[PDB]
Amino acid sequence: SPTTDRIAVVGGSISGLTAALMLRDAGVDVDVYERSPQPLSGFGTGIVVQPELVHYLLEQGVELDSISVPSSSMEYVDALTGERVGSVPADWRFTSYDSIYGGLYELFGPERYHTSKCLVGLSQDSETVQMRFSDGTKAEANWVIGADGGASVVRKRLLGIEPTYAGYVTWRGVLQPGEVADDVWNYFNDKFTYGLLDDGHLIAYPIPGRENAESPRLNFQWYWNVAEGPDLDELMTDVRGIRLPTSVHNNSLNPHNLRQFHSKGESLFKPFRDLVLNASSPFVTVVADATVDRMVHGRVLLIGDAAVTPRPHAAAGGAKASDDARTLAEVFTKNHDLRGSLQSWETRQLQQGHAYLNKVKKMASRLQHGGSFEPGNPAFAFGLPKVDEPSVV
Amino acid sequence: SPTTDRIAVVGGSISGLTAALMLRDAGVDVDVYERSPQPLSGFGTGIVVQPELVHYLLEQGVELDSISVPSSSMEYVDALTGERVGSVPADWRFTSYDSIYGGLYELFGPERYHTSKCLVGLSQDSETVQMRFSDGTKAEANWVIGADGGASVVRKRLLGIEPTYAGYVTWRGVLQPGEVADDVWNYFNDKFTYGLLDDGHLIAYPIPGRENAESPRLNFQWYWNVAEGPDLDELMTDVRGIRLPTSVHNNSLNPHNLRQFHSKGESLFKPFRDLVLNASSPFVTVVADATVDRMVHGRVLLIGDAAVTPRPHAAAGGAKASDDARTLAEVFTKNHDLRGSLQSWETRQLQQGHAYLNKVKKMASRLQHGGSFEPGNPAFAFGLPKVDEPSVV
Ligand SMILES: Cc1cc2nc3c(=O)[nH]c(=O)nc-3n(C[C@H](O)[C@H](O)[C@H](O)COP(=O)(O)OP(=O)(O)OC[C@H]3O[C@@H](n4cnc5c(N)ncnc54)[C@H](O)[C@@H]3O)c2cc1C
Ligand SMILES: Cc1cc2nc3c(=O)[nH]c(=O)nc-3n(C[C@H](O)[C@H](O)[C@H](O)COP(=O)(O)OP(=O)(O)OC[C@H]3O[C@@H](n4cnc5c(N)ncnc54)[C@H](O)[C@@H]3O)c2cc1C
């Protein structure tokens, strides 16, 4: 028998829904509380597919070829002069935030996914955890899973930890067929491409169409080093004067920032220049990370970006989150000495979490500084670091 | 001859408009850039009248009795048990933020008061200062006066200084005739009243009607000590989940916070209890202060809450701001060795500014802790500290 305990999940995205689904599948009584008034949106941005990230969906019968897009190499290019550093065979598939989210939400349904529930307070005793929401209501559970992302309030309330700026930001853009010339489309299609600079880099790869039937798109990012203080403050302030914590979305950019994005883009080697100048809704997001010594805090658990908050470079953040969710659900599934199992659980997941953070840190120290970033370097490959013993394929 | 230089004023409130008006009066070419899309609003809150605060208006023919309201004593009461600590004769007049602002704006006019201009960047050389706005435009001046208030961006960009939480917040409420019983209205009318507690205090005083012809109102505040971190974070988070920096306005309160305000209010001695329970739009504002060693930074000057950011206890913040503006305008009026005069100017205004901060700090250490706060104590009287030699009345 799975637990007869009541579980609340705060945060209804990749980790939240994964946790909930698996607990619901297992008979566990579970609720999701999501700050968002409606079901979600990633603004059509790319996600590199890892096993862990699509594990749940595949288990339910979703065909991989239907939520993702192939590649057959990985390219390394000087993004100023176009000089090719090198290319290696590769077969990453790429999906989109909407594809994963939309798949998970579709499976879960609205009945117990409580929108407009923004946690703002939390407290706990030996039986239960009380949650308080910004709408003035409260819910109660035996266990609460903080699946509330990089700016996790749960983690802020328990530990005082918030993301620390990493020194740089990333512009994010998505192109549709015909928004760039065919030869530029062909340059990036069916490939992950790094455009490396002396002080930053771009990445580009194909992704699925916004809806089932639509054509594939090109996803790209450009990482800029921006000095904390005046410089970052001016980049992160929207057209209305609010200095935002994480992203300034396209419809809100200070026009000056948008001109700067285009004008710096003017110096890039043609095909990258064309991504930057032709994107219709580019937007900007800080790079910030955070860590945590424990994921277990009495009856409150942290998973996904709310435990260790990653940087995007190894393209497995959402995979770390799914795994956190899966292993956690399994604990309440197996339901044998919860205190003990959770201790064992967090040890593995912390080591995974810390190792992932170290990798993307090392990656960033090459990628943001024109440091050597060698084609095919196994230390810099996408994916979660091996934490388990290897098994037979 | 006043300067032929071009002056820009960033921030269009009490200090901004005062500066601008006096410079315009003197022939100086000046512009105001205000973040706000429309002319302003203080949400009908009280301001105790000081000479400095109404100096400009009176000089223009505005009659004091028409923008303010009398009192004939100052009362000191235990706000739990109603026991009167004491009363002293007094003749403070009280006005409202809207009364002062509305008077100043009316005199200045829209022509050179540029709304929707939120400064987000600043830089300067030996001739000029360039201002950059959140709308992507820029203006240029010879001198820039940072009149942008407690959360001054100008001061943030030049110095890295922002307000520091002081340990407490103040609830703010305004009552109209008939929203409380007549005997409660009569209790507070024509008086400034302190309701003192073991760990905080209320103040109440009459103020003018929202419009020329309307009846007088009752303004009140209740200062609560709220621990930085989880507690303050939950108080300062609005119904939508945003943790706000300064105020959570009534239409946005987490209903739980509003219930808490009412429920704690339930323990007060009747007439204070009635203010708190009957206010229709109470709202909350952090108490935070900041200081500055210089008000002169090349060609950028800080005045009002953007130089030394006060706490409200001596009820002369807006007076400090007017004075900062007046003395500064005078410098450009007199126009004789600007570098030298500005050095002399800031010395006086800093001493005034620091002394004011020390006073309200000392006041707070009594008023938020049930410390002794003796009726009529000259050290705790409202007003700016004497900085000049005394003159003949
Ligand atoms: C630029 C970029 C590129 C990326 N590329 C990849 C990639 O290639 N591969 C990969 O695996 N990952 C990638 N990721 C990482 C992946 O996006 C994240 O790791 C993942 O979305 C984290 O899932 P999560 O549910 O833990 O947090 P989130 O997705 O951030 O969701 C947390 C949820 O909680 C909600 N919430 C927040 N606060 C509250 C609260 N107070 N109360 C209630 N609800 C709240 C939010 O609304 C949100 O729905 C990328 C990320 C970015 C930024
Ligand atoms: C609870 C309370 C009670 C008070 N009681 C009294 C009293 O009894 N007596 C008294 O004298 N004073 C009192 N005050 C103090 C008085 O309100 C302030 O000292 C005064 O309003 C400061 O004037 P200011 O123009 O310097 O700043 P503000 O009034 O804060 O105005 C600054 C202006 O700049 C604008 N701005 C901000 N940032 C930007 C930017 N980025 N770009 C462009 N514009 C920007 C804002 O919109 C605002 O209009 C009280 C204050 C409070 C909080």
From Swiss-Prot, chains A, B:
SUPFAM superfamilies: FAD-linked reductases, C-terminal domain (SSF54373), FAD/NAD(P)-binding domain (SSF51905). GO terms for molecular function: 2,6-dihydroxypyridine 3-monooxygenase activity; FAD binding; flavin adenine dinucleotide binding; protein homodimerization activity. Its cofactor is FAD. GO terms for biological process: nicotine catabolic process. It is an enzyme of class 1 (oxidoreductase). FAD binds at S13, I14, S15, E34, R35, V48, L119, D305, A315, A316, G317, G318, A319. Pathway: Alkaloid degradation; nicotine degradation. Keywords: FAD, Flavoprotein, NAD, Nucleotide-binding, Oxidoreductase, Plasmid. Catalyzes the conversion of 2,6-dihydroxypyridine into 2,3,6-trihydroxypyridine in the nicotine degradation pathway. This is 2,6-dihydroxypyridine 3-monooxygenase. It comes from Paenarthrobacter nicotinovorans. The gene is dhpH.
